[PDB]
Amino acid sequence: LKPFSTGDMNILLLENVNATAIKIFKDQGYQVEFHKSSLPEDELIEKIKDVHAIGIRSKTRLTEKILQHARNLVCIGCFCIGTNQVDLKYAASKGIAVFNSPFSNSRSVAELVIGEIISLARQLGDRSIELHTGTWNKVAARCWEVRGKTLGIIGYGHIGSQLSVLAEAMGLHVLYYDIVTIMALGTARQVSTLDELLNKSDFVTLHVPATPETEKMLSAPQFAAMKDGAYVINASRGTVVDIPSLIQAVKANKIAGAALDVYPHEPAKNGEGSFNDELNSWTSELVSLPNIILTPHIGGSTEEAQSSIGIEVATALSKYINEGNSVGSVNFPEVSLKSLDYDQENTVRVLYIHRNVPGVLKTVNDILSDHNIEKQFSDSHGEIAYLMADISSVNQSEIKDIYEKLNQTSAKVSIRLLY
Amino acid sequence: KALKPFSTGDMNILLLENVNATAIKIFKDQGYQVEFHKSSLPEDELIEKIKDVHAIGIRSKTRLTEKILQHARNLVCIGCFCIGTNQVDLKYAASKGIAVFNSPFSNSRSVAELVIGEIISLARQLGDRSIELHTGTWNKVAARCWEVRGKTLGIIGYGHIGSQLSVLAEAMGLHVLYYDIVTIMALGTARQVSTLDELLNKSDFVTLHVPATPETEKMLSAPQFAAMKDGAYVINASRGTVVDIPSLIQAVKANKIAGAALDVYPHEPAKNGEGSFNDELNSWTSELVSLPNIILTPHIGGSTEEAQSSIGIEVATALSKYINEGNSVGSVNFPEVSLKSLDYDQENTVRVLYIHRNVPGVLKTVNDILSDHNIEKQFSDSHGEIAYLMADISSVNQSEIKDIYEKLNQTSAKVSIRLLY
Amino acid sequence: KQPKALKPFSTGDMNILLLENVNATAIKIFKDQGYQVEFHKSSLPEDELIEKIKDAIGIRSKTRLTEKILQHARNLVCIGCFCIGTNQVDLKYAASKGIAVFNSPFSNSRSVAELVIGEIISLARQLGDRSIELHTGTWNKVAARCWEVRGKTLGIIGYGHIGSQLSVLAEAMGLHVLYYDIVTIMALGTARQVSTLDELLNKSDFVTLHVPATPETEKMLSAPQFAAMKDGAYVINASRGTVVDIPSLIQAVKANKIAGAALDVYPHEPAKNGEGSFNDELNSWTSELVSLPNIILTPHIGGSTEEAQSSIGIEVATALSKYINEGNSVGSVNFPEVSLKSLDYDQENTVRVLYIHRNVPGVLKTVNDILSDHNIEKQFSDSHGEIAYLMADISSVNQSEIKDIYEKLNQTSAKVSIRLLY
Amino acid sequence: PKALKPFSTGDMNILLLENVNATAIKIFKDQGYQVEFHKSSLPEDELIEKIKDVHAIGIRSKTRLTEKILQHARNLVCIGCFCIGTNQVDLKYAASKGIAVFNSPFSNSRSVAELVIGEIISLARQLGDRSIELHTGTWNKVAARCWEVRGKTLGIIGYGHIGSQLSVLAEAMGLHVLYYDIVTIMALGTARQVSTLDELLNKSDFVTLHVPATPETEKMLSAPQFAAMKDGAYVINASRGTVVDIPSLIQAVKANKIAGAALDVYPHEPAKNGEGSFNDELNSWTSELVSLPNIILTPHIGGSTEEAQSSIGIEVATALSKYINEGNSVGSVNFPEVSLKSLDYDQENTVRVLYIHRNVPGVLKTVNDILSDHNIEKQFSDSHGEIAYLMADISSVNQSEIKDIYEKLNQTSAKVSIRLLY
Ligand SMILES: NC(=O)c1ccc[n+]([C@@H]2O[C@H](COP(=O)([O-])OP(=O)(O)OC[C@H]3O[C@@H](n4cnc5c(N)ncnc54)[C@H](O)[C@@H]3O)[C@@H](O)[C@H]2O)c1
Ligand SMILES: NC(=O)c1ccc[n+]([C@@H]2O[C@H](COP(=O)([O-])OP(=O)(O)OC[C@H]3O[C@@H](n4cnc5c(N)ncnc54)[C@H](O)[C@@H]3O)[C@@H](O)[C@H]2O)c1
Ligand SMILES: NC(=O)c1ccc[n+]([C@@H]2O[C@H](COP(=O)([O-])OP(=O)(O)OC[C@H]3O[C@@H](n4cnc5c(N)ncnc54)[C@H](O)[C@@H]3O)[C@@H](O)[C@H]2O)c1
Ligand SMILES: NC(=O)c1ccc[n+]([C@@H]2O[C@H](COP(=O)([O-])OP(=O)(O)OC[C@H]3O[C@@H](n4cnc5c(N)ncnc54)[C@H](O)[C@@H]3O)[C@@H](O)[C@H]2O)c1
Ligand SMILES: O=P([O-])([O-])O
Ligand SMILES: O=P([O-])([O-])O
Ligand SMILES: O=P([O-])([O-])O
Numbered sequence A: 001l002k003p004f005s006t007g008d009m010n011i012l013l014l015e016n017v018n019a020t021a022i023k024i025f026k027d028q029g030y031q032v033e034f035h036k037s038s039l040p041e042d043e044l045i046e047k048i049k050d051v052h053a054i055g056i057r058s059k060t061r062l063t064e065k066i067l068q069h070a071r072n073l074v075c076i077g078c079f080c081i082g083t084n085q086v087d088l089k090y091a092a093s094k095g096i097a098v099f100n101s102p103f104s105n106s107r108s109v110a111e112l113v114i115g116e117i118i119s120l121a122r123q124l125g126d127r128s129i130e131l132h133t134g135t136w137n138k139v140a141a142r143c144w145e146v147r148g149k150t151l152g153i154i155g156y157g158h159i160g161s162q163l164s165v166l167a168e169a170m171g172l173h174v175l176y177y178d179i180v181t182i183m184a185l186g187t188a189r190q191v192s193t194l195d196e197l198l199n200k201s202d203f204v205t206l207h208v209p210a211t212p213e214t215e216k217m218l219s220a221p222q223f224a225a226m227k228d229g230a231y232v233i234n235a236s237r238g239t240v241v242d243i244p245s246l247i248q249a250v251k252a253n254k255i256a257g258a259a260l261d262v263y264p265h266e267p268a269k270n271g272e273g274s275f276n277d278e279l280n281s282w283t284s285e286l287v288s289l290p291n292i293i294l295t296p297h298i299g300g301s302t303e304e305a306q307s308s309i310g311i312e313v314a315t316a317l318s319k320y321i322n323e324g325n326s327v328g329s330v331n332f333p334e335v336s337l338k339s340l341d342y343d344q345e346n347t348v349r350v351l352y353i354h355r356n357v358p359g360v361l362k363t364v365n366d367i368l369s370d371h372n373i374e375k376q377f378s379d380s381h382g383e384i385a386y387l388m389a390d391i392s393s394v395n396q397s398e399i400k401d402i403y404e405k406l407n408q409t410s411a412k413v414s415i416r417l418l419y
Numbered sequence B: 001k002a003l004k005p006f007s008t009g010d011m012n013i014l015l016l017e018n019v020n021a022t023a024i025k026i027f028k029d030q031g032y033q034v035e036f037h038k039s040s041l042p043e044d045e046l047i048e049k050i051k052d053v054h055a056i057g058i059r060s061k062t063r064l065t066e067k068i069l070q071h072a073r074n075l076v077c078i079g080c081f082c083i084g085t086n087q088v089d090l091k092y093a094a095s096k097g098i099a100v101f102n103s104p105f106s107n108s109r110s111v112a113e114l115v116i117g118e119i120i121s122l123a124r125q126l127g128d129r130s131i132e133l134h135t136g137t138w139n140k141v142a143a144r145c146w147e148v149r150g151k152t153l154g155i156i157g158y159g160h161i162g163s164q165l166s167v168l169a170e171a172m173g174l175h176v177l178y179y180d181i182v183t184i185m186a187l188g189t190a191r192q193v194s195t196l197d198e199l200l201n202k203s204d205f206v207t208l209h210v211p212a213t214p215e216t217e218k219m220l221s222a223p224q225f226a227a228m229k230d231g232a233y234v235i236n237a238s239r240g241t242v243v244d245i246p247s248l249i250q251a252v253k254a255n256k257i258a259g260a261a262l263d264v265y266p267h268e269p270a271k272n273g274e275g276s277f278n279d280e281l282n283s284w285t286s287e288l289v290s291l292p293n294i295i296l297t298p299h300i301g302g303s304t305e306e307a308q309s310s311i312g313i314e315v316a317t318a319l320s321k322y323i324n325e326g327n328s329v330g331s332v333n334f335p336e337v338s339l340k341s342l343d344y345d346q347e348n349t350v351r352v353l354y355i356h357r358n359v360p361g362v363l364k365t366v367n368d369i370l371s372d373h374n375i376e377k378q379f380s381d382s383h384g385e386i387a388y389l390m391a392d393i394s395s396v397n398q399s400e401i402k403d404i405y406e407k408l409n410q411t412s413a414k415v416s417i418r419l420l421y
Numbered sequence C: 001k002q003p004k005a006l007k008p009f010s011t012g013d014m015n016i017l018l019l020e021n022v023n024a025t026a027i028k029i030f031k032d033q034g035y036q037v038e039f040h041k042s043s044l045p046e047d048e049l050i051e052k053i054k055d056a057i058g059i060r061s062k063t064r065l066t067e068k069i070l071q072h073a074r075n076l077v078c079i080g081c082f083c084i085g086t087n088q089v090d091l092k093y094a095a096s097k098g099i100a101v102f103n104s105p106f107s108n109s110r111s112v113a114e115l116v117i118g119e120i121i122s123l124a125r126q127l128g129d130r131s132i133e134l135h136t137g138t139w140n141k142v143a144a145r146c147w148e149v150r151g152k153t154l155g156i157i158g159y160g161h162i163g164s165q166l167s168v169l170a171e172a173m174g175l176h177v178l179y180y181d182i183v184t185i186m187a188l189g190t191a192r193q194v195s196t197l198d199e200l201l202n203k204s205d206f207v208t209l210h211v212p213a214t215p216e217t218e219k220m221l222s223a224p225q226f227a228a229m230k231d232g233a234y235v236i237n238a239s240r241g242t243v244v245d246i247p248s249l250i251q252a253v254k255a256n257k258i259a260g261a262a263l264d265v266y267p268h269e270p271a272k273n274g275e276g277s278f279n280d281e282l283n284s285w286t287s288e289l290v291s292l293p294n295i296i297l298t299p300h301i302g303g304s305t306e307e308a309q310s311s312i313g314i315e316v317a318t319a320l321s322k323y324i325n326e327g328n329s330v331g332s333v334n335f336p337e338v339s340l341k342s343l344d345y346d347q348e349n350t351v352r353v354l355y356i357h358r359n360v361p362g363v364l365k366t367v368n369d370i371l372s373d374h375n376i377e378k379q380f381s382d383s384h385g386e387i388a389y390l391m392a393d394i395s396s397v398n399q400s401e402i403k404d405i406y407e408k409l410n411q412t413s414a415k416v417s418i419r420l421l422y
Numbered sequence D: 001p002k003a004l005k006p007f008s009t010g011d012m013n014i015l016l017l018e019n020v021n022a023t024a025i026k027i028f029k030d031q032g033y034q035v036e037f038h039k040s041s042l043p044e045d046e047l048i049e050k051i052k053d054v055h056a057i058g059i060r061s062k063t064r065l066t067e068k069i070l071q072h073a074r075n076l077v078c079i080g081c082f083c084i085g086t087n088q089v090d091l092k093y094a095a096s097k098g099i100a101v102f103n104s105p106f107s108n109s110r111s112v113a114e115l116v117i118g119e120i121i122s123l124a125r126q127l128g129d130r131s132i133e134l135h136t137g138t139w140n141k142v143a144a145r146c147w148e149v150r151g152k153t154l155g156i157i158g159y160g161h162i163g164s165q166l167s168v169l170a171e172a173m174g175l176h177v178l179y180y181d182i183v184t185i186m187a188l189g190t191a192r193q194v195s196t197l198d199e200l201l202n203k204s205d206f207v208t209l210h211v212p213a214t215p216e217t218e219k220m221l222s223a224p225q226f227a228a229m230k231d232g233a234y235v236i237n238a239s240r241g242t243v244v245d246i247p248s249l250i251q252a253v254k255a256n257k258i259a260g261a262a263l264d265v266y267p268h269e270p271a272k273n274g275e276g277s278f279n280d281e282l283n284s285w286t287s288e289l290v291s292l293p294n295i296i297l298t299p300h301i302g303g304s305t306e307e308a309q310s311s312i313g314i315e316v317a318t319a320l321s322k323y324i325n326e327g328n329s330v331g332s333v334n335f336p337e338v339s340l341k342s343l344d345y346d347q348e349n350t351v352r353v354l355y356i357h358r359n360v361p362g363v364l365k366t367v368n369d370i371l372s373d374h375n376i377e378k379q380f381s382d383s384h385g386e387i388a389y390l391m392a393d394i395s396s397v398n399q400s401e402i403k404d405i406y407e408k409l410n411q412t413s414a415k416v417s418i419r420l421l422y
């Protein structure tokens, strides 16, 4: 049904990507160099020269200094959520598409919150520390059944919706405040003001992205705006909660418990003493506080999650390496074609990345005036632009000429022809 | 025309060891004098306060034995706001015609939700990881940390807690299988298993929801563990004897069981203490705490406000229904007897509540006495050496009720008699 | 648990006759407990009926039982109406002679609901009339006033067994459910109980009746009520043949006020199946009724499914077996509802007394005097009018004692029947 | 800051010709159009006169629009078939004049699904026969081989738009769902995809067809296959008039192998409604078929509901509005599917070119030279046959410059239709 291209390139994977990425690459038929740890600037630069696609994680640092030397690279796949460890503006300038999987931790974050809602309601965390050190304190005051309480979801997005149905299944009443009017799922209610959600809610979760409107969204003023004995959970971004204000609020018995998965300063390496007061001045005060579940950014750290993120991003790079499909790139125009589901043979695909200056399409379509262009799609994501064209009857003698003509043009950034 | 005055303060009820307020609402809305205490009272103060009380509501702390109930006259029923009839001398209470009630199934959702939470904590290892960040260590690990969706939960006891656990677990995206000595109509998408071993083979999480029986003691031992999937999880919030704790610590250290969560233990302390959960209680305490992914709780399954509130509602209505209509269904130590309230349309119908010794000829005695009026309904049953009779007699005259009461009170082998009108 | 073994041995032989084609599951239950069963496919005549009855009867509303045919019937224990209604059977006399009557009224609950669901869709899409048309060669493909069921509102009158089951089905199909009932009944699913019947009619597209036959319900949907529901709505009656004023409905349907209707019961129904039964001689409007668009007529088939009949067999056979073997009589129509625990193989030499008497004072004085020699563990009696029923479990009894006890009890004044279990 | 502003006239003109749902008028009027509505299909003469300046014409299954009657249309842009099929369109002609054709093929999913649930329940209970019987005066109250639908199993052949909706509804009524589809499709609810059609037929009590017309589906269910079904099961076909071997079926029902069946589509359906169209002349088997018991016949109405025409209106009007206003041609029957982002009004100096041309080399050389004076932000061209469609967004343009840009593009060789939108 669908034709492939050349198909014999070389990819380097750096920080332990799921084997499902490996199956997709190898079953696609590529050469794959796997590494278990994060490499230093020197060994990486030497290894990137003849590499074609690199799959990095949040630790490996890719900058213009180390990316200047990579001249045979096509696309960079971040098997991550975050993109800031890659110099997007430069990679766009050199015509390299970057891909990621931003919504892969959805079910993994929902299930975590549910467990943290129940554990905080029952103080299960405190109880396990207590029996571990030999103390047995069986109290039932302020221990609740989750059923019949109300859950306030802040940000009704990918994580927010999945959480909302689950909390309904557990028998909680769901309220969500969102800047956008979003069709509520199940029995939830869209609220008009944030104050109404906070006032009426027993549990409050944060599932918003990082914006200045969300920075310290819940601070000491915001905390007091809420139910008499309540709980707060933040598993979005380390700036949404005023942690000094929060430790103040928790010590005053205003918030019954809380569970946090993200902090303002997280360390970059696992260590036996990493989570100390040196990163956060308040760490000792929090640890000495009751019924708080502290976690090291594990919201999306599940086996099932990593397998899904691996498949998705590897499939994305595979489709971009084999077809021109760039949809989902962070720093690139989103461009795609029928990829020849009915097309016959002797058909070439032009993938022309250029600088977005007028007349570029004039030069190119003139170069192509000799053969029929069946489909064409070009879009511009800033200073760089991307063109795809399918020409209908080319011979190996002609394909050579077509490439050099395209290579000699002004504002060529990258040129490829798929056979 | 006839018509009778209100007696307030006629009944006097005593509630000990902090019974939930739903109980006081149920009692006061009916109108009683209720002496509430937040603690368990001393031997002197109790006997002083119990002589003329009419109904006592206690919990597992208050000890009511033959010595303290001997002096108590004009007592009607004892309400254990408990699961167990802990520290009540039932045989003596029955002997003096005292009904004891409790609410054994009020902790069902509170135990189910706990299990659901513990399944998630073990799968994500939230317990060990939250301890680590609390102690300054940072280990963000994702290997053998699973999403619950798509796994299977093996429920060992498909009773009140078992069924409730099942629907919740399916809602979370688990496949549920349950093994039970009884075939039980599956709820929802659950699957009844043929042998326990099939469950052990096929399950990723296994929970225990059985009672304490000789068949259940150390129900999960080393053969059972090896018959479970490589790296599965175990939860027991049923009874402290159901799991072979040494066998389990052996299996987990051998990396055959990934983690487990326990709410009940073989030797739990009888009083709260600052260093109570020590090795003196259980020889394995040091070995257990050392394992990597173990979630331990102090018999907290079901220690929730909603659980206690339901216990109050259930036991307070039960005692109220016994005091007002003689209805004893559900008593722990008593015959279970009950009759249709009354229709109110027919007047001058009295109801006899005759508690007697279970000896032949008594029913001859009573029905002769009642031979003057028509007995529309009658029901008597025997539970031990004691028996209980309730009857509705028709067209009785206020002059006659006193006579019928006096004749009945003078009978042989009557332990307590009461007439409603 | 328990063994729950106990076998009734006073006479030692009983023979029950299940006629008018009772479902085969009723035959299995009776035979498997061990009885003689005389099976008949039809309803018998008075002469053949009176004979064979001396040496349990199962009827099907067709069989006519009056005091006359039961006076001669001796050694009778219980009558099982494998019916919903126990009508044209003389309940009061059978009680007078101490004969318990049983039935199964809620076994057709799922069959009637599924019907209405079926009748809702077809009225909306006019499937019936369209099929008549194609059968005679006419082809009229019209889409006007044919609706999707999803999004409409169903007015359920009476929220009982059928009303309940119908409600979840109506929603699952995507209908909004509104229901009117004289009693406040906790809605199932998303349904809403309405205040006034007039409210229900006003907002409803389909109205079904699922109420019993009472003077309050007779012709309860008449010309005012039809004028109250929305223009073009639909009327369904599968409850009782008196609840709809057919003249009022037929007036409305001719006036294009009501789009269609489906009727499963009528004021005057035939007593036998026939080729020309449904005529004006049976019901004055019958000719005008049939000459109307989109009317679904059915011959009291609401409860006529194989599954319903099998369910009717299991229920009533189980009830008769329980009354015969343990005496549990709960659910009898004309009898006191009395029952006691199983008994047990463990408790040996424990007899059960089943004593039916006239509801007159002093019977228990007489009876309990007789039993004074042995201990009564449990005893229960209740009265359903002039007749009353007593159950007793006696301990430490021997067949030597049992004979005297039956002899003494059979000799009592105003005692009507005596039975022993062993 | 110049902010040049146009005039408002009655120039915008839309023509709706035969039986359009009221939702198109609302969508068109609320968008701000002049709409000429007609209740019937007009003759060639009246049509030609009315189409000359129509920006947009909407026809139905009746209206005949051909190249000859389309020659006169000059200011015409798109033809919207408020249909499932585009049979009377003459697509090649519309393409030649650069006219896009639209339709709504999947609107009838819930209407045909609901019909099936009703027809399943009606066959199970033999409602059609019973209602014919009472109308003809006969009263036959039979329950034998009449079933509750709950607990039986439904076999779905074709799990597409209709099959999927049907599966959920059938489960709601208490059925087990099995489906055979040539493509492995993710089952909905508790359904199971079965491997072979033969597996499906053996275990099923009800069989439904929801497949397209293919040589693989033509006479898909024939006599070998019917004999491969449960003894005394049911057959439903509301897909295509070619999928069932009607003689094979009539054989099986007369052989008491198939208890009943319901058909909505046939090999030879009339093109016009008639009082005698469906005679033996139309289908050789018609007389034998109609004489068979428990068969539900319907005249290709599985999608003839008000809700269906309302949904069709919303869909096709929305599609035409998008082509007129934004150029999005996705879903056209005879046209390339081309679309670009909605164009945030915030950038107020960008033109949109909708350039329809002949699919020959050098066109994009010619065009992008013309547009070379300004930056083309986005561009998208695709080709359907000999015609092609270009959309381009060119930046920082002034009303002064637009005249040239339109003039040059209108002046190009092999330009068939050009439109600029800002
Ligand atoms: N803990 C973890 O390890 C982990 C894992 C995955 C995602 N996350 C974080 O969780 C967050 C949610 O992820 P997602 O996939 O749900 O994103 P999302 O973009 O689908 O949803 C975010 C939602 O928040 C809403 N929103 C934004 N600002 C808001 C505000 N001020 N008030 C109310 N609503 C607001 C947006 O409208 C949007 O619907 C992101 O910040 C993501 O980085 C954390
Ligand atoms: N953790 C807590 O603090 C807490 C609170 C309340 C109840 N519980 C305990 O939980 C247990 C279950 O409570 P419940 O309400 O479900 O009781 P239950 O009587 O409702 O259910 C027990 C079930 O176990 C089944 N069963 C019996 N023996 C079995 C065996 N050997 N193997 C498997 N199944 C067997 C029975 O058939 C029954 O279905 C009890 O022991 C109860 O005291 C614990
Ligand atoms: N078509 C058949 O063959 C067939 C089969 C079975 C049952 N039925 C009939 O259907 C009817 C309903 O049966 P059911 O088992 O649900 O009975 P039901 O007793 O369970 O329910 C009847 C309900 O109607 C309500 N009601 C009574 N009078 C009312 C009034 N005036 N207005 C509104 N609501 C009123 C009652 O409160 C009750 O909830 C019965 O009459 C039954 O005989 C017909
Ligand atoms: N009765 C009516 O008036 C009416 C109305 C609308 C649609 N229909 C017809 O119903 C049919 C289904 O419509 P839809 O919207 O579901 O279409 P669809 O394309 O969504 O679904 C058709 C399904 O059939 C499957 N399939 C195709 N050929 C098959 C074969 N030989 N065997 C098994 N499976 C096969 C396809 O994979 C697909 O799942 C169409 O033919 C349509 O014309 C009839
Ligand atoms: O008491 P009595 O005899 O039953 O009336
Ligand atoms: O008298 P009695 O038998 O013991 O009850
Ligand atoms: O290439 P083309 O010119 O579009 O056809």
Ligand SMILES: O=P([O-])([O-])O
Pocket (backbone or CB within 6 Å): A355, A356, A357, A358, A359, A360, A361, A362, A378, A385, D374, D375, D376, D377
């Ligand atoms: O040529 P351009 O417009 O830049 O794409």
